[PDB]
UniProtKB/Swiss-Prot annotation, chain A:
The organism of origin for this protein: Rhodopseudomonas palustris (strain ATCC BAA-98 / CGA009)
Effect the entry attributes to changing residue 216 to F: Reduced catalytic rate. Minor effect on substrate affinity
Residue ranges of domain AB hydrolase-1 in the record: 29-267
Name of the protein in question: Fluoroacetate dehalogenase
Functional description taken from the UniProt entry: Catalyzes the hydrolytic defluorination of fluoroacetate to produce glycolate. Has lower activity towards chloroacetate and bromoacetate.
Taxonomy, superkingdom: Bacteria
EC number from the UniProt entry: 3.8.1.3
Amino acid sequence: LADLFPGFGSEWINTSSGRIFARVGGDGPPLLLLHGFPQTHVMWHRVAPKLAERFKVIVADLPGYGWSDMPESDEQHTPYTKRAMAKQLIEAMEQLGHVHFALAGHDRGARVSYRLALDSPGRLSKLAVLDILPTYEYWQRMNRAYALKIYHWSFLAQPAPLPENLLGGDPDFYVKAKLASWTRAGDLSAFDPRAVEHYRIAFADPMRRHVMCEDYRAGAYADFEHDKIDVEAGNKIPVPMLALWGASGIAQSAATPLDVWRKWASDVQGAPIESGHFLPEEAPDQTAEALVRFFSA
Amino acid sequence: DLADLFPGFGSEWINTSSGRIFARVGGDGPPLLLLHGFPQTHVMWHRVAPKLAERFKVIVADLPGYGWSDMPESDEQHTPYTKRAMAKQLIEAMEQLGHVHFALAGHDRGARVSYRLALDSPGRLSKLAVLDILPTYEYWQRMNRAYALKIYHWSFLAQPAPLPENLLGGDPDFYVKAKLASWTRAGDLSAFDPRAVEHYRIAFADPMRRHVMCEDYRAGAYADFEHDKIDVEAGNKIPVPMLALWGASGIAQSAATPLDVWRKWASDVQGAPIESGHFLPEEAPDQTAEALVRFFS
């Protein structure tokens, strides 16, 4: 596998829930970058160098993803709930001396991020979420059109071992199918092939695949329940937040993203990026410029 | 090695303009067409058909594309697998036997053919029974988190080829057994005759058959929904006396009973819950057989 972060160090951060792998580079204020599915920390490889010019950039594999350890799940998928992932990444950041840091997350990592901001807002200076709406919102907007577009939300949430067994016959196909279908082009051209190989290799591990399903099971159940409580209780993220989404990404299908996020956060700025779902890879300059601008204010 | 579960039934290959329909035919009396659904074949009727064949000419048909029926070439609209087209093909099939007016009981996908047949061509039907379905439109219209997780396959199998086909290729024996198992009251395969399971398993073992099933569900998400919506919007009701049976467990029984929903679609509908999961004729054969006999007589 390629080193896609020349000059970045590599850290295995112990937490109570397992080691978090991260690439670490730059200097300045700490900025944690979290990837989503079916990716690893390397998805940040085109924007992290630009962020590293101004921030101490920590590009972490989510708990259970990439080279991070896989906490054994349970019937409630607890370690793969965004609440648990956020606590675990808070612990990891603490291990590095970062008790207050900026956070940008993409996809699942963005869900960890806004859950972290709801549970532990004191930990965050600024939060950026890329191409997501809160999990609750996706579920509450899950009509026929949306059920078809993000079928995987319900497919991967099926009880084990059903998605695992189906994924295992040809894992390469599925990871590549998901990378391609959520891009603007609908193919792999936006991805550095070396990055694709990272994603495919992670996806090749049955245990990694199971973790992704656990993440999605959490997504369907506990994560939804957690969000539901906050939305019903009128709890908004108090952390200044940037919501970026791809003009042809997943978030914008369910709804107008800024309107949704203004319901969830008291200080939200939003901007679309002409991109599919994979903003930092489909639109690295634009994404990085948006993140740099936002985190630098 | 495929057991004959209809001793005394003949086996008919019925030619239609879209290909052959395979049917077991037994009994004597008014014609009654029994249509299975997914992921089964006509043999699902093996426990109730002999009781019906005491009073009716029972035609136990493989749906177009299913079982031993020929598989019409699909198209970008999945036309041959729309319930409208399947109805039309089964009407042609019944006409080959000289049955222009017949009773119809359908389960699952077959019940969707059946009520569509009833909407498009109600003069072909003396009486209609639908087992453990609501109209396709109602499924999609009530689409929410709970139903998306429960009937996830409605959106999964409707994904563009070859995504479901490839995934189903991952473990087809597991998938079909998981679907049969998970939709019963028991949660396992114990309600099924093992020899029937072998039929379902072998049909499901054929990639082309699996592709047809996906074509069926793609129709179910697109054209079938559009056809139902037209009837809802035009207020078109089924004028055929109809019996709606559903499993107290399984795919419908929620807030309003299936009967309440069906009453919006049918002018003359009676309904009863059967102590069953989804697979009424196999989980609850005597009760199913009794209700059908009583209704069709």
